[PDB]
Amino acid sequence: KNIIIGAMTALITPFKNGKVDEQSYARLIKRQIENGIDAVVPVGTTGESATLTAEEHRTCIEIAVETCKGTKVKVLAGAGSNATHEAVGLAKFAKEHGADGILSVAPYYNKPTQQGLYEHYKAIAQSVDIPVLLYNVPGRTGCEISTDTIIKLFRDCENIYGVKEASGNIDKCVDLLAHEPRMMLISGEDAINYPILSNGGKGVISVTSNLLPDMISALTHFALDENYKEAKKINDELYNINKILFCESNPIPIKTAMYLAGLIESLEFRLPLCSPSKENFAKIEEVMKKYKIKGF
Amino acid sequence: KNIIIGAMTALITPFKNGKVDEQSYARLIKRQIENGIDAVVPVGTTGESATLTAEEHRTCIEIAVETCKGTKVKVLAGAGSNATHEAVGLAKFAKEHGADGILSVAPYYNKPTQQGLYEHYKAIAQSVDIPVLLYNVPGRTGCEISTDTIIKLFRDCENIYGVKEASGNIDKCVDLLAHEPRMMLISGEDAINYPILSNGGKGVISVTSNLLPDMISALTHFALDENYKEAKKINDELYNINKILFCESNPIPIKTAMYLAGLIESLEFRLPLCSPSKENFAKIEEVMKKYKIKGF
Ligand SMILES: N[C@@H](CCCC[NH3+])C(=O)O
Ligand SMILES: N[C@@H](CCCC[NH3+])C(=O)O
Ligand SMILES: [Mg+2]
Asked: Which residues share a beta bridge with A40?
């Protein structure tokens, strides 16, 4: 299989006057490239995929592709949807516009059965010839891709090469890699990046890397080299920021932190996302003091 | 406030050859009208709102309006979205095409904060002048509209008149009506229709009424007329079917039952929804035997 692994960033999507700030987006991606990130994920959960239009979602994938061109950095395009025809549409777009692979979140809200999830991802995988990474985040979607379903899709569909797990379930991560050690397990939960990598996970799709790409990149590559002491030290050091970045729903804290660090011009969301509480704003600002934040 | 209450049906959306069967859709609504239903909800969760296009969603609202025109039955159009600009668009469409009100599910997947939910619904309520019913279903959306937020919204926005509760939390239903008895609490969970009505809830938005509209209507009207013994009697009778209709994720069982009753032509869903397992198909068929299903 072709794979997309290593340190990866679930990119925030900046807004200026309620529109996607495309110049800021490219600058942010270029900051990720220059700080050791192996791949970028445009328009995931952290990129506010829900509130982008179909056209803006596609524009952000194109900016990612264009910015990473002539570099070693890959684009794992956000392409999930709770409608299979929508997810197939995004997968085919990402393939046709030069993405290296796609991320595809499990359908949210409509709670398909395991049989339905299998057919959903099978339809997506068959529509393209690039790698497909499953994405399990039951706290957001209301459904779970079971270990059996993941393993069946990995074994049955050529391009499905692993899963981004955001479920706080290290038992499942053991279950997945003990029964199917060939898949690429990707951490979707920054606080437990090191435990997942130390069990044979092969990368992270990180929120924190938006702010601290150098630290997440170093953690991941240390762990991949089995330098566990060094990877753990960074994971332990990052714990306070990893958790405060979820004091409110992601991406409210990370955009707050990026704004506080001067990396985006305005603290702007699309409704129903909005600014953090005044208190949580201050809690984020205080935790940030303990870290060295790279500029442009 | 202007309100829409009583016995209401979350209409299934039948498909034929992968498109909305607009003739069957109108026929099903007329079966609801003739069996005492007070309002119909086109394109809710049960109507597979996630997998309809913008156009199909709008077409279904129009058919409901047209079918209920010159009748006593109201249209409470499904208009929710996890993107506020989308929910405002659907709210304005529903107002402009003659719906009596809108249902608006809490944003799914992107998990807004309580402040974000307040602003989301304020934007929706201010966009139209027809009644707005909030819709809380945390098992599907991943977020909860808190009792405080509901109440604030009810008191601050003239068009917001209540909530459809689908959270299995009768304590919350006591909380809501003890602190704000003027709101219309609507049951969105068939198995506990009677407990919610007997505490002062004023209607149901039903899945089961698709199959047994006469029974759900009678249950609601007994309860509103304070015949709690007869409303409870029907609620008890319906428990087996109310429960089997969620053996798999709604609307997979209800469409299976509608197809088994000969009320829709094909057992067709849009992916990621799919046929129930063979075992659940037979279990649904078996439970149905105990009920008398009105035809057309
Ligand atoms: N709000 C819808 C549409 C998003 C379309 C672009 N990502 C959803 O979250 O699925
Ligand atoms: N699948 C998207 C778009 C649906 C648009 C029509 N209801 C969502 O669930 O939000
Ligand atoms: Mg090395």
From this structure: A9, A75
